[PDB]
Amino acid sequence: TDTTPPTITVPSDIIAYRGEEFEFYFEITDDSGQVKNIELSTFGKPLGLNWLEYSEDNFNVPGNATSDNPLRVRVHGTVPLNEPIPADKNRAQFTRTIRAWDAAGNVSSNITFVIKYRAQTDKYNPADPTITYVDRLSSLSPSEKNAVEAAVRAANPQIPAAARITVSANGTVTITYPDSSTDTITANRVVKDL
Amino acid sequence: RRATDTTPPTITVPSDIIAYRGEEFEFYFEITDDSGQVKNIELSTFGKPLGLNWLEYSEDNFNVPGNATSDNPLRVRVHGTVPLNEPIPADKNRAQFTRTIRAWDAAGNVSSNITFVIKYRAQTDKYNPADPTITYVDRLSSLSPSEKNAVEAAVRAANPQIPAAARITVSANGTVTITYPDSSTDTITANRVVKDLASSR
Ligand SMILES: CC(=O)N[C@H]1[C@H]([C@H](O)[C@H](O)CO)O[C@@](O[C@H]2[C@@H](O)[C@@H](CO)O[C@@H](O[C@H]3[C@H](O)[C@@H](O)[C@H](O)O[C@@H]3CO)[C@@H]2O)(C(=O)O)C[C@@H]1O
Ligand SMILES: [Ca+2]
Numbered sequence: 001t002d003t004t005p006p007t008i009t010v011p012s013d014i015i016a017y018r019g020e021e022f023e024f025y026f027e028i029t030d031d032s033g034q035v036k037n038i039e040l041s042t043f044g045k046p047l048g049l050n051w052l053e054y055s056e057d058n059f060n061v062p063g064n065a066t067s068d069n070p071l072r073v074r075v076h077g078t079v080p081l082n083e084p085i086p087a088d089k090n091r092a093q094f095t096r097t098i099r100a101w102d103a104a105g106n107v108s109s110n111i112t113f114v115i116k117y118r119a120q121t122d123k124y125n126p127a128d129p130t131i132t133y134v135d136r137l138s139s140l141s142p143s144e145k146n147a148v149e150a151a152v153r154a155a156n157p158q159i160p161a162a163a164r165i166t167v168s169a170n171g172t173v174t175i176t177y178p179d180s181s182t183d184t185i186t187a188n189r190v191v192k193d194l
Numbered sequence: 195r196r197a198t199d200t201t202p203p204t205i206t207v208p209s210d211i212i213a214y215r216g217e218e219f220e221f222y223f224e225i226t227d228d229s230g231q232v233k234n235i236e237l238s239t240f241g242k243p244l245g246l247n248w249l250e251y252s253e254d255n256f257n258v259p260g261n262a263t264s265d266n267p268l269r270v271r272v273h274g275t276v277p278l279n280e281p282i283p284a285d286k287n288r289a290q291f292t293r294t295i296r297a298w299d300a301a302g303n304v305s306s307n308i309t310f311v312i313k314y315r316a317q318t319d320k321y322n323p324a325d326p327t328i329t330y331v332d333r334l335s336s337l338s339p340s341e342k343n344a345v346e347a348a349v350r351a352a353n354p355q356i357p358a359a360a361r362i363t364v365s366a367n368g369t370v371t372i373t374y375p376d377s378s379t380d381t382i383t384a385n386r387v388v389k390d391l392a393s394s395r
């Protein structure tokens with residue numbers, strides 16, 4: 001008879017960026033070849049992450065969780081755009097647990113997984129724009145600022161369309177991401193004297 | 195029939211020359227002579243240097259027989275661009291250059307200088323922005339980056355007549371600034387640009 005609970009592999013680097021959908025997988029195996037169900041919790045208490053969701057496809061089917069072909073549970077969600085980020089980044093995370101059980105009811109211990117979350121600028125790192133030549137490096141014209149923004153945008157299709165690119169009087173570029181975090185492109189990467 | 199041409203050419207000048215800074219403009223002088231031939235012209239400041247290096251004209255068809263009759267006058271195309279940052283004083287009407295033109299015929303007769311006036315104005319005198327379609331925002335005092343993008347695109351879409359080189363900026367409360375290439379501006383107040391999304395649903 002089966003007296004051995006399932007075993008769970010969790011991803012080691014779940015990193016989510018505010019306002020951007022993430023996904024990851026748990027992999028569950030049981031010696032019977034069948035996993036019945038799982039539970040996500042805060043060490044047995046309610047999960048408390050209403051923006052997280054996981055698929056229950058293929059739960060409780062014979063052969064759904066063998067060593068060769070484990071049960072792969074897709075988890076996805078979006079950390080809130082305005083989720084506060086602690087000053088200490090080791091605390092900018094949610095530590096949670098998962099347990100699973102087989103058809104005989106053998107339940108695993110609580111296995112820890114950690115969802116780290118970060119500002120969008122930690123994902124983003126703008127690429128170099130083509131240089132814009134300007135008449136005065138300390139006082140860009142409106143047309144030159146338009147050109148600078150266009151060039152930053154053209155070089156960075158991977159940055160959210162919803163990010164706003166602004167240009168200062170000296171050609172310094174600010175990129176403000178939807179979560180209000182920012183990147184800066186120094187003027188020497190952006191403009192040169194005509 | 196008189197033995198010689200002693201009559202200088204006759205020049206018609208345009209009456210209302212208006213140029214906007216940074217925008218190419220053009221106007222025409224029309225010149226006739228009793229001989230039918232005009233040799234050349236001079237643009238001056240009452241006989242002094244013109245002192246307007248951005249003013250140009252074509253010498254096409256100059257000094258050609260029949261180039262300047264009453265039926266077919268010599269049409270001289272003058273064109274140029276008033277510099278983007280040409281100073282406009284506190285009195286906008288002082289933003290003008292009074293200059294003079296005369297013309298020679300092929301017999302040595304030169305007309306007496308007559309005046310023409312090039313008025314120049316800021317680009318915002320030419321452009322009147324239409325209000326954008328309203329952008330619906332979550333907080334009227336603190337637009338998001340996507341909402342400012344939307345506002346700018348809405349203003350841009352409602353005003354295709356505005357130059358592409360004009361820069362549209364959007365403040366935290368949705369106040370729009372259109373800064374034309376010559377750095378003159380137009381404003382659209384926030385109440386004509388953004389509305390609260392929740393109250394409008
Ligand atoms: C931007 C600006 O300040 N515009 C002025 C111009 C400029 O000062 C000048 O044209 C650029 O060189 O002067 C304006 O005044 C002139 C105007 O009153 C004309 C009238 O025909 O006369 C000029 O003085 C003449 C004078 O009439 C002649 O007798 C003399 O031989 O030459 C003088 C030199 O031009 C005035 O300067 C203008 O309209 O051009 C007024 C603008 O506000
Ligand atoms: Ca088992």
Ligand SMILES: [Ca+2]
Pocket residue numbers: 063064065069070
């Ligand atoms: Ca399977």
Ligand SMILES: [Ca+2]
Pocket residue numbers: 121122123124
């Ligand atoms: Ca990074």
Ligand SMILES: [Ca+2]
Pocket residue numbers: 149165346362
């Ligand atoms: Ca823009």
Ligand SMILES: [Ca+2]
Pocket residue numbers: 199200201202203227228229299301303
């Ligand atoms: Ca004559």
Ligand SMILES: [Ca+2]
Pocket residue numbers: 317318319320321322323379380
């Ligand atoms: Ca205007």
